[PDB]
Amino acid sequence: FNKITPNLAEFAFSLYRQLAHQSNSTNILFSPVSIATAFAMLSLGTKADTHDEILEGLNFNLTEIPEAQIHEGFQELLRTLNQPDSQLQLTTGNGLFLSEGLKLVDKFLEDVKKLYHSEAFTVNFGDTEEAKKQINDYVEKGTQGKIVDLVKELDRDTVFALVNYIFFKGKWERPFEVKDTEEEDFHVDQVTTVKVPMMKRLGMFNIQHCKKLSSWVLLMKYLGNATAIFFLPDEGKLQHLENELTHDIITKFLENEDRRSASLHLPKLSITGTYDLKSVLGQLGITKVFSNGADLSGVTEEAPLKLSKAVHKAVLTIDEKGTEAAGAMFLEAIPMSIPPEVKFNKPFVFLMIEQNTKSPLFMGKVVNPTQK
């Protein structure tokens, strides 16, 4: 089911095409969910233009959807992410860091902790370096060592910092057997290749070839409550795919429960995506909260405040199947017939959708597994 998801979808695409044009030969990885829910939670401390700008920046038509519904929708999602339709290893969090000395509004801190279950702390921004450590420690501790020293530096007038991260490494509901994981070619160019550990499995896959998107569309079911959608653009059809993607078409794929025999070659990789939300979202029109004109009265009533730091870092690790545990052995009726060998051996885009809410958890493009 969906509620605000269409709003999150178009947000994911906007934020994607944003990074896909600007940045050219880089793996892209961001959580449309972690980011939005973060700025939707922050909007609760904003007022007037400053606020409307955030919600509108998150692809929300304020004139058509009651804000009460926007936040209600986000809570539903987090409810599913806390204790879902299944415990899917997801290490996501949002930490706010405000100056020790600001008389923060209790209500906002309520909404942060209770409503959006986000961590908020007060630090001494007088010691710029200590704040970074203090912050980076939070993330690291929270990602249990996967993310280290996220923030490399803070502005001179930093009094409010936002750190948003998400680490995922799901176990395949239908794993690849490590024995078959050999290293193979990966086309970074039409004439150049690179070697990467290529996983492979002959089986009944929810694979298809969409002519509209000019690409092979593979739906990998995750042991948890998320579904991996991979898009392998045709020869020279990457820009087209990126431009033809629509929440509709993706919902069409989700509702698709067919499967056919295919020899899937999917690379093993652990890509990352570190982004400066101030910059990236500013491009989406969210600027007032990050500047001197920020109306963060919900955060702190009497003293000026603005969002000096807003950083996102998404990490996604794909392999044969999480970690060796209850393997659960299934069997598939594979027809005797030349199955299409589908190799994800060239730039491809992809998304991770939470099965229930259909919220885009991760969106990205792998240009080269080698980069991290």
Short mmCIF file of all heavy atoms in Angstrom, two decimals, residues 67 76 112 307 337 343 351:
data_model
loop_
_atom_site.label_atom_id
_atom_site.label_comp_id
_atom_site.label_asym_id
_atom_site.label_seq_id
_atom_site.Cartn_x
_atom_site.Cartn_y
_atom_site.Cartn_z
N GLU A 67 -1.03 18.88 5.59
CA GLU A 67 0.25 18.60 6.22
C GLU A 67 0.11 17.53 7.28
O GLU A 67 1.05 16.75 7.55
CB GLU A 67 0.85 19.86 6.80
CG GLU A 67 1.22 20.91 5.76
CD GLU A 67 1.81 22.15 6.38
OE1 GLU A 67 2.06 22.16 7.61
OE2 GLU A 67 2.04 23.13 5.64
N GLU A 76 3.61 6.20 9.56
CA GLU A 76 3.21 4.85 9.14
C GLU A 76 4.42 4.07 8.63
O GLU A 76 4.64 2.90 8.99
CB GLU A 76 2.15 4.89 8.03
CG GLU A 76 0.75 5.26 8.47
CD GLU A 76 0.08 4.20 9.34
OE1 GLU A 76 0.74 3.23 9.78
OE2 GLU A 76 -1.13 4.36 9.59
N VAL A 112 10.53 14.84 17.72
CA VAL A 112 11.74 14.21 17.23
C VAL A 112 11.86 12.79 17.79
O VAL A 112 11.80 11.82 17.03
CB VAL A 112 12.99 15.06 17.56
CG1 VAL A 112 14.26 14.30 17.22
CG2 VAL A 112 12.95 16.36 16.80
N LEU A 307 20.24 25.70 9.79
CA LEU A 307 20.87 24.40 9.57
C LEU A 307 22.19 24.55 8.82
O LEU A 307 22.22 24.64 7.59
CB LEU A 307 19.91 23.48 8.82
CG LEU A 307 20.22 21.99 8.87
CD1 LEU A 307 20.52 21.56 10.29
CD2 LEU A 307 19.03 21.24 8.33
N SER A 337 15.43 -25.16 -21.65
CA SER A 337 15.33 -24.19 -22.74
C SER A 337 16.38 -23.11 -22.54
O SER A 337 16.64 -22.72 -21.40
CB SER A 337 13.92 -23.60 -22.84
OG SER A 337 13.46 -23.14 -21.58
N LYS A 343 23.56 -10.42 -17.74
CA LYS A 343 24.71 -10.01 -16.93
C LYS A 343 24.68 -8.53 -16.59
O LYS A 343 24.62 -7.69 -17.47
CB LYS A 343 26.03 -10.30 -17.66
CG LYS A 343 26.25 -11.73 -18.13
CD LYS A 343 27.60 -11.88 -18.79
CE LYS A 343 27.75 -13.21 -19.50
NZ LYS A 343 28.77 -13.13 -20.58
N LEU A 351 16.66 0.31 -7.43
CA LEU A 351 15.96 0.87 -6.27
C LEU A 351 15.63 -0.26 -5.32
O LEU A 351 15.57 -1.41 -5.73
CB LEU A 351 14.64 1.55 -6.67
CG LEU A 351 14.60 2.76 -7.60
CD1 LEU A 351 14.70 2.33 -9.06
CD2 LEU A 351 13.31 3.50 -7.36
#
